[PDB]
Amino acid sequence: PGMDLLCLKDKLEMHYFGKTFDDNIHIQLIYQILDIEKILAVHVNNIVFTLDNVLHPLDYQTLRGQTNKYDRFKNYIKRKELLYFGEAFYHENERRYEEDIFAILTLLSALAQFCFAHVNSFWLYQLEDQLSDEFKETLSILWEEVTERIDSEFLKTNTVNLHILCHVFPKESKETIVRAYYEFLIKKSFKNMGFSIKKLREIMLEQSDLKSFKEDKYNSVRAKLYKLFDFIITYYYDHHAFEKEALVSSLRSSLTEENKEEIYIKTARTLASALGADFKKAAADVNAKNIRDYQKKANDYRISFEDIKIGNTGIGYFSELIYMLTLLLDGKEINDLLTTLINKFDNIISFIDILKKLNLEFKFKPEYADFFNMTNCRYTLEELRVINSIARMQKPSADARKIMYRDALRILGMDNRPDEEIDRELERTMPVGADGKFIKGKQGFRNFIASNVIESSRFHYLVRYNNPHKTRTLVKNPNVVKFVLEGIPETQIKRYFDVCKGQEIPPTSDKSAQIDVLARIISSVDYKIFEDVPQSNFSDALKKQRYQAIVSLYLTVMYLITKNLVYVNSRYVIAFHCLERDAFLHGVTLPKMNKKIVYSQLTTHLLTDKNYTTYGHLKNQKGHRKWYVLVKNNLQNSDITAVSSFANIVAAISVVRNSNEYISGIGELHSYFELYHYLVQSMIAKNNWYDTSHQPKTAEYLNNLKKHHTYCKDFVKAYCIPFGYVVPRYKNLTINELFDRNNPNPEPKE
RNA sequence: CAACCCCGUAAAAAUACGGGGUUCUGAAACGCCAACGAACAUCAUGACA
RNA sequence: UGUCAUGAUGUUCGUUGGC
Ligand SMILES: [Mg+2]
């Protein structure tokens, strides 16, 4: 009755709650708690790698007494490439105090030590009684800085709709409209109702009362109309209250889907007859004149609402930590981290409701009781919502731009040269003159680099994750370049080809013809071509666009390789994190031999267990013995040293770092899976991370790689055997067709 | 695209084939990616007391 | 130096195609 395949129901229930239950609602609740740590660990590992790449290697009172850790801290905090991170260590063009930087580094180290599994196992869930009083101030200062920013910035960028809403509602204070509308979009009070207001709006639109807004001229404003109807709806339920309560009971007591549709149609039609005039009044006030007039007077409302906001309210110690992680990430990574966490906490709250409704036990153990209860899980959700809804520009400062000029020219030529030659070329191209000024009328190279390289999101990704000294080798191999261009959709390629065409090639519609032409342009690019850009005539206009297209194509190719190789490494970090978590509960410790770790001990133990072999993934029955044999077959082809060496590569991300010594001998590519594994097998080759005495089969694996210049499929099935106890994960990480969920190829026939 | 469990007709194997399940299995799907749009903030351009 | 036009770079919502 609800027993899981991994055979860990009772252990998890007794670890979290305190006893065993005959129901299938608690274990699904526990898996979400298990899930959040995975993404948290992935991103912590990424941040640590970036910090170690950019910066080459009691309380604060003890720090000075050490005289050795103090010496390292004095220079590490003085190392002046900290400017690459926007607001982590520099605010208002001045360096933060040493204590705050020490606090951030120590907190990052503690979180990294917690996830990759000294600190207790309860650290993340009880921070109130474990955090020192000195570390409770650093988080407060950082959040006080942003709470003043959001207050002044929220009362703008939408000062068109909010004026009309207050005009519709006369008998309400200036506070009330702002409070309700802030509760509407900043933190979604619209989300936590069982109604479908968007569907209800469509059903009302089927009525002639408010479908008179379907004119073609209404296309000038669409988004600022759908939102307005929603807020009017959500306040209508708020004032009625009892009517909303009755509708909930009626919907919950529905028999079939036809009854639900009839009630929704009846509910929609009576709403139109209820406040149809109100709907008409708001929608008739929108036009070009009023929008421009209201935008002119954007300071007619003065509401502070400082008391409500979590900047002054006692924001939790857990949500402040997430904000600290946000300062060390970019726009794309923030969305992935926060959106996953919101989904996790939404589902946790719902499960507790089911347990309460059905009259079942829901209290946790005394250790988890403080954090995991119904009220706290609500509060921690809107705090995660308000963090995600912050506008970020991430401009490249004003002092950090001097360093960025040095690196920008290193990508485009003079890779691995002394800093003396870098400065001379900067002086030679764009001069300074007298009194440290800038020579007017003779400077167009700086504006080109500043507005197309320094202020680009692709460029920041490369500097953080890759070394600009050795980044040029990524575009020297035609096979790698050709594959990346094929991934770009067809619509972009046609645009790029026409602009970068030149005057020596004819127009051709063959996609393969265009790719080869673009490959030669990208291969040979130097900054010396960009020394004649029109300063401040259709010839000048065409030449400016042509130069812009080439540099964007240059960085796009490099940015995709780095991003996708990191993604593949992130998939294997999750796999190793689950092994340590699962081996602890089963009672199986991972031993050592010759200062190594046998990562294949768990799968050996589970191959000879009666319960797992009968009620688990690896099954031994007449008709269900396929994957029991294959894993047992593939176990006898594994090297202890090779598994240990692979674990170190995954943890430290050595594929991205040492990719310039092996990407010059690749044969032919078809997916990012092949490129990642070719590099991994290459390192094991020359570094001699194997042993043919204990397994004479690794010898033939390495011979196939060199004579074919492509990865060997059998060899990846050997060192991934520590994941053999979970069949779906073993298949996904060892067969290329099942790796990416965007490939419809079938599993190869054996 | 794969794993797991029910009910079917042949069968005893690393079991094929036809219907339904699965937050208690793994893949970012409340997610990513392109082209057209309405706002807004940046930077380089002509008209002026 | 404030304003009006003018083309470029990037966030934010929404319509439509593809995963
Ligand atoms: Mg799951």
Question: Could you tell me the resolution of this structure in angstroms?
Answer: 3.3
Show the tokens assigned to A291.
Answer: 């929008």
Show the tokens assigned to A184.
Answer: 């509407």
Which residues are CB-neighbours of A202 under 8 A, at least 6 positions away?
none
Residue A694, SS3 per DSSP: coil
Cα A520 to Cα A284, A469, A475, A676, distances in angstroms: 58, 22, 10, 25
Residues 43-82 of A with CB under 7 A from strand C: none
Residues 201-260 of A with CB under 7 A from strand B: 220-223
Residue A91, SS3 per DSSP: strand
CA distance A680 to A663: 11
Nucleotide nearest to A350 (CA to C1'): B23
Rounded to the nearest angstrom, the distance between the alpha carbon of A31 and the centre of ligand 1 is: 7
- Contact, A298 vs A156, CB < 8 A? yes
Q: Is A672 exposed, middle or buried (0-12, 13-18, 19+ CB in 10 A)?
A: buried
Nucleotide nearest to A740 (CA to C1'): B27
- Is A31's CB less than 7 Å from nucleic acid strand B? yes
Rounded to the nearest angstrom, the distance between the alpha carbon of A28 and the centre of ligand 1 is: 8
Which residues are CB-neighbours of A507 under 8 A, at least 6 positions away?
A498, A501
- Contact, A343 vs A165, CB < 8 A? no
- Is A507's CB less than 7 Å from nucleic acid strand B? no
CA distance A490 to A467: 31
- Is A447's CB less than 7 Å from nucleic acid strand B? yes
Residue A20, SS3 per DSSP: coil
Rounded to the nearest angstrom, the distance between the alpha carbon of A405 and the centre of ligand 1 is: 46
> Which bases of chain B come closer than 7 Å to a protein CB?
1-5, 11-15, 23-35, 37-41, 43-46
- Is A492's CB less than 7 Å from nucleic acid strand C? no
Task: Report the amino acid identity of residue A268.
Answer: A
Nucleotide nearest to A27 (CA to C1'): B24
Show the tokens assigned to A596.
Answer: 């190594």
Cα A230 to Cα A113, A176, A234, A272, A638, distances in angstroms: 45, 17, 6, 14, 60
Residues 651-710 of A with CB under 7 A from strand B: none
Nucleotide nearest to A2 (CA to C1'): B24
DSSP string, A557-593: HHHHHHHHHHHHHHHHHHHHHHHHHHHHHHT----BS
Q: Is A402 exposed, middle or buried (0-12, 13-18, 19+ CB in 10 A)?
A: exposed
DSSP string, A296-344: H---S-----TTTSTTTTT--HHHHHHHHHHTTS-HHHHHHHHHHHHHH
Residues 94-133 of A with CB under 7 A from strand B: none
**Interatomic CA–C1' length for residue A148 and nucleotide C6, angstroms:** 37
Measure CA A557 to chain center: 21
Show the tokens assigned to A680.
Answer: 């991994």
- Is A296's CB less than 7 Å from nucleic acid strand C? no
- Is A443's CB less than 7 Å from nucleic acid strand B? no
State the structure-solving technique.
cryo-EM
- Contact, A715 vs A701, CB < 8 A? yes
- Is A288's CB less than 7 Å from nucleic acid strand C? no
Which residues are CB-neighbours of A224 under 8 A, at least 6 positions away?
A160, A161, A286
**Interatomic CA–C1' length for residue A520 and nucleotide C7, angstroms:** 31
**Interatomic CA–C1' length for residue A723 and nucleotide B3, angstroms:** 15
- Contact, A548 vs A556, CB < 8 A? no
The candidate with the shortest Cα–Cα distance to A337, out of A697, A736, A38, is A38
Nucleotide nearest to A335 (CA to C1'): B31
Q: Is A26 exposed, middle or buried (0-12, 13-18, 19+ CB in 10 A)?
A: buried
- Is A331's CB less than 7 Å from nucleic acid strand C? yes
Rounded to the nearest angstrom, the distance between the alpha carbon of A6 and the centre of ligand 1 is: 13
- Is A391's CB less than 7 Å from nucleic acid strand C? yes
Show the tokens assigned to A160.
Answer: 């068109």
CA closest to B23 C1', residue:
A28
CA closest to B11 C1', residue:
A623
Residues 159-178 of A with CB under 7 A from strand C: none
- Contact, A730 vs A722, CB < 8 A? no
**Interatomic CA–C1' length for residue A220 and nucleotide C14, angstroms:** 12
Cα A437 to Cα A263, A430, A440, A674, distances in angstroms: 74, 11, 9, 53
Nucleotide nearest to A24 (CA to C1'): B24
Which residues are CB-neighbours of A434 under 8 A, at least 6 positions away?
none
Q: Burial code of A589-616, b = ≥16 C-beta within 10 A, e = fewer?
A: eeeeeeeeebbbebbeebbeeeebbeeb
Helices (H) and strands (E) in chain A, counts: 33, 2
Q: How many other C-beta atoms lie within 10 A of the C-beta of residue A303? A: 16
